[model samples]
Target: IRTEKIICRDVARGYENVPIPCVNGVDGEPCPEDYKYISENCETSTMNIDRNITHLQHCTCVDDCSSSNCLCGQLSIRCWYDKDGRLLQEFNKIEPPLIFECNQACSCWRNCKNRVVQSGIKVRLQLYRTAKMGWGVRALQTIPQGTFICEYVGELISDAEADVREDDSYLFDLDEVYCIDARYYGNISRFINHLCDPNIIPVRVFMLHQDLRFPRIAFFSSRDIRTGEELGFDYGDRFWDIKSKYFTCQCGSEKCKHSAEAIALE
Candidate 1:
């Protein structure tokens, strides 16, 4: 029977979940589309997650932040860190104002004979070949007038102990403190073989870090030196005041301090 059977006329369907401009659905009723549980809320959820991200924490002291590179103001001392967060040396410059101090019951003063300064220091010395010193340990390499070498190493011992030490010859006098021995051999400075006029002079620089205070030893160019010269820093004070007295005028400067006493004399 071609009776009352009726098929719905074919028509285009409205797009699902499309945005509408109505603030209220009807009678000022709340709209279902705006609630956070709807499909539109998925977009809002993603934004919230991205806004709350975690970052690496900043460490104030090495004791707190166990990182290899501890940043303190302008200076940093690279350290070795283990998986357990323990800090140690990793071929780094064992710097001073060190987190660890001398274990002995000695004064912490620079000239205290029993401190880091009294132990002949070591420095990370980089010498690039130039037309100056020849190719060897302390050969020709143009360096700044005053720059730090490596820091001193070894246990800080009192001057009294230094005096009785068999390797007493390496002891270098820095005021009241006896800097006994460069970090080389027991007394390598002896084999250094002094020249009438040496090329290098020892200079001191403060290890400038806001939280730490210490000194660094440096070697400066005394004057314009020639090639194939052995780098030797004048351990004495004659390089300063011209009229300064010296033990001998062996420095061979044209203005050589041809004096016999230990004062800066010429």
Candidate 2:
């Protein structure tokens, strides 16, 4: 018998039972043969990364992020959280925002305040079975509005490959050209379900590079979220139009269109 590796566990969520974390399974049940999990982004075509792609513009700095050339310092991009980890009013806007965190290639210290998403997932989250959605991710702690969640990591495939695999539900369209398929292997973000009224929103961010095709897709809380609430983001009309052939949405929100035909009503 074949078994998958257990990546992480969440005992702090205080649910009747701790959520299970599997690379390609739901609640420890083995994923079907179709669910071949890949831990990192698998690309069909090569992605050209410049030597400085992951590096920030050079700047002279002390232990603080005060350099003029500092992309984060110049942009006024920091954690933007209150002492209690809540978001500040200036950042709680309805219009989504992008964050340019200082990279290691910069002169700033690793402890620079401008680094948030670079630090990775700070709050506890869990992957649990949803009553309707096969698997869903949930926060174990109160997540304030505008808080950075996690990046949507997955396999980067060419446009042709995406079109060939017409029914992949995990295909997240990054732009008009490229899409990320997380079905093979991904982090907790992969289990986040879709909702007509979602607490989270996906924001495209360009940090270390100026390449539009390679912009990182990060999720942030659109509003204050309570613990144990399932995390979700609107899949948009494009997804429903293309992938609605596979699953019927059971999101149950009053705003739920329920079917692709009702998309215009959204």
Candidate 3:
């Protein structure tokens, strides 16, 4: 859910890109027709929390924001892109744990440079099956480095709810205190798999709101992503630990250390 309505068309188009029903079934099993396509914001069956964290603040500027009180000026963070939509800085150079972006509260125009992820998915993407990873998402166009791809949205829940769903295959580590379970209700980002060396990276973003505990999780192109290229992001250090629960990686990167053959070499 979002305070600002992000109206992104489902990229699956007319394809039958349904979620795999039987969790323990073979990787390549075809999804049954019973699996319906629910494309609204992640619908929570229970837990009547504020799914869409609505914003309460609104900037007074009605045009290009030159005021220092606006979100960008207040946080001392510049727009991530230029007038032509190309990135202004190196992808990895962006310091983490803190990302500020323009929201519905901003007085700037809808196409303001500060608004990227809030504008929603711009390029085309599709859901397809991977040989080993089952389902994966791929870009339909060449995505320039630092381009905003999609926000990792799902059923927002507390840290305690996250702990109970630790074994969930589609849980995203939202922050230090929250997690997003996208298994049942999510956008195409749910199909994006993991890679040791990935073309995509998840960035944490915060808008000026009452609660500081929860922030938005958005995916960006870490490098130039070509058409038909599979999108993926690293699962982070915890997933790589030998003591943690393991999922065999088929990322096929030169730096891949998950394979049995590669682990032996380590």
Candidate 4:
């Protein structure tokens, strides 16, 4: 949410209207100029092991930029490299694989949930591609079930940071985007527009970035997602406004609660 530019040693700050270089891709391409380039920082001390390996090295172009290269700026993340895998040949799976139970706390003290949460873990990228939206990941192999795909597009911040960033008019807030914050960085659920009778329910995951040992916003599959299939999550679970208690039942689910709430009063 913070339009403020980050100052990294290798990559210069983004231009006034253009996104910074080294975030990812080469002039709007999937891989950076150095296609087979290995990130300088990949060790445990330098990289955050909390992050999934697959989405780590892969890059993405974000829509939140001024005259961006991919029509939107891009983010270049660091992860383990695999010759066979597009980004990661073998990725890490969280200890408690269940998304709901993952720690959402953006505390710096804990290990499971760091301060920064990454978005788009495998699900977000797939959906973004399915939607035909600008910027997506390119998989080199056939990823199996429960495999961590790629990190979402965004930065990591604490609750206080999130609030401060939200106040800014530069970008949209997680609550506004995906209707949920989970107390990490930006929400990945925003890019996913509402679909009638959605097929999959969104589950939240705590993604720790490799660069910084911080908890990032990542998404997981609530159900089996076949290869070449789009990934999705339940927007209502985290975003539905409880106070308003208003939701439309446009989703053609046999048990569509159509009401503006993830849970039915029954």
Candidate 5:
């Protein structure tokens, strides 16, 4: 008698624990060989350099770190998330916000209420070819206000590497010192396009490493998102100011700079 065996097959290209369908024109097809889908940052150093990193201040809360004394909570300056692991309120973007997630050393439970960013993606997302944009990401489920989306996983490079390649659009500034280049290596977040009217906002999150200069990039839902609505955020108010010379807007917003309109100066 012959023995039968079973092998597990994931629903998406990337190892998304949840099924993320690529519902698009070329659906159910494998991505190109050059493109690699990553769920975390790939450290690519232009130079081999070393520096001492300060130890992280973890929680002693034995329970949820949402309590007043959790060191990680204090680092956040205020308790950002509520009981459901969702941000309590919309963050003010006038000033950059630092999200202090529970570190690995915290006495808090593995499923600590305060540890949102490190817990990984929980939403149902889809990859599709948009009518205008090359590719785009949308939600398969309604995303509640302040929901924690996936981090912008990419190739983390030094400032020197970024300065050398100024025109690369995928480079997201972690700080003045480092940038995340997702052009060749990136996750589903890379397909998220620019929307003049936004749905999500970028926030910096510090996880295992306490290095303030290299916080991870996370996107939180700015408002309650409807299912099937395309996800987007303003690349920058002045993103086109620099990129429009060679690139034009594909945004469907009424405020779009599209329609053969690139010479409009400030």
Candidate 6:
């Protein structure tokens, strides 16, 4: 899979705080190759996209910023996280179709609890090849509910770039005009498999800017993840509706949407 002789201890190559190790339990497989590991989205050569969005003004609050007051916090559908800075368990489904985080413009301290996804990958992860899913990511340690995982990084291309072909895969879109195709450039997130009963959810986090149609696709934990547990999220209805005939759900969850048994029912 990879072009290298041996997998690096930290796949991110010092891009993250903790090392993201790659494990090959399925024989002596090579490391994943070709694509570079990026921590965030990088603009691709399209010239089709622009910043048609506006950012919320910074808050006046100091270190006391919490769910109630911070202007940046108020701009979001909800202040989102609790004092502990994890997504509020009370508000799981986030309804984001985008969520706002404390920007650098804010008067808050560098330790602002308002920053999670912006802080980058804190939890360690492992890349393991699974029997059914070619590659899957697992937590190296226990991940609490609502912890912000890595973003679905890739080549940030325009809608025109996205319309290039049907063989297209691994493209994440915020809207019709916005797309991030990880075909060539991507991070460890490209390997996260889909599960009907997922412990993760895709929430739009605006760390760059709050363009309604152009926000970063971030993966936040939807449930308390035990140590060594695999991470997954739903692939959305659009994927299943169109690709169902060929792509079967091998997540093995009892609530699988299109498993071998579920496909027979359909």
lDDT of each: 0.30, 0.64, 0.62, 0.30, 0.74, 0.77
Model 3 residue 132 distance off true place after TM-score fit, in angstroms:
1.4
Question: Which has the better lDDT: candidate 1, or candidate 2?
Answer: 2
The digit string of per-residue lDDT tens for model 6 on 1-266 reads 53323366877888877888887766566787778888767875644434433445567777657747778777765588777778876774747535677776777876777787888888878888777788789998899988888889988777777787464558777665777788788888888988899888888777646666667888888989999899998878776876787878898888997887998886
Q: Which regions of candidate 1 deviate over 4 angstroms?
A: 1-138, 147-155, 165-167, 174-178, 183-198, 205-216, 237-249, 258-266
RMSD to the hidden true structure, all candidates: 33.5, 6.1, 7.9, 16.8, 6.2, 3.3
**Model 4 clashes, total count:** 26
Task: Please list the residue runs of candidate 3 whose C-alpha ends up more than 4 Å from where it truly belongs after superposition.
Answer: 1-28, 31-63, 66-76, 91-94, 207-210, 242-246
Clashing pairs in model 3, backbone N/Cα/C closer than 3 A: none
For model 5, residues 1-266, the per-residue Cα lDDT tens digits are 42222111222455766756654453333433355678777865543322333476677787776678887877767768899988877457545468788766777788888778888889988776677776678888999988997888888888788778855777787654888888878887887898877889888988778777677898989889999899997777445667776667777666665424533642
Best by TM-score: 6
Which portions of model 6 miss their true places by more than 4 Å? 1-6, 46-56, 92-94
lDDT of 2 by residue, 3-49 (tens): 44444443222221224343423355443334434433556568664
Candidate 1 lDDT, tens digit per residue, 128-231? 22122221124334443222222322233445655666644234443435342432222112223233465544433232211111223333344544444545
Off by over 4 Å in 2: 1-44, 53-55, 66-70, 73-87, 92-95, 207-210, 259-266
Regions of model 5 farther than 4 Å from truth = 1-14, 26-33, 46-54, 257-266
Count of backbone clashes for each model? 20, 3, 0, 26, 0, 2
TM-score, predicted candidate 4 vs. hidden true structure: 0.33
Q: How many clashing pairs in candidate 5?
A: 0
Candidate that would win on lDDT: 6
On TM-score, who's better, 4 or 6?
6
* lDDT of each residue in 146-187, candidate 4, tens digit only: 444433333433335545544321122343122222222222
TM-score of each: 0.33, 0.75, 0.75, 0.33, 0.85, 0.89
Looking at model 2, residue 60 earns an lDDT score of 56
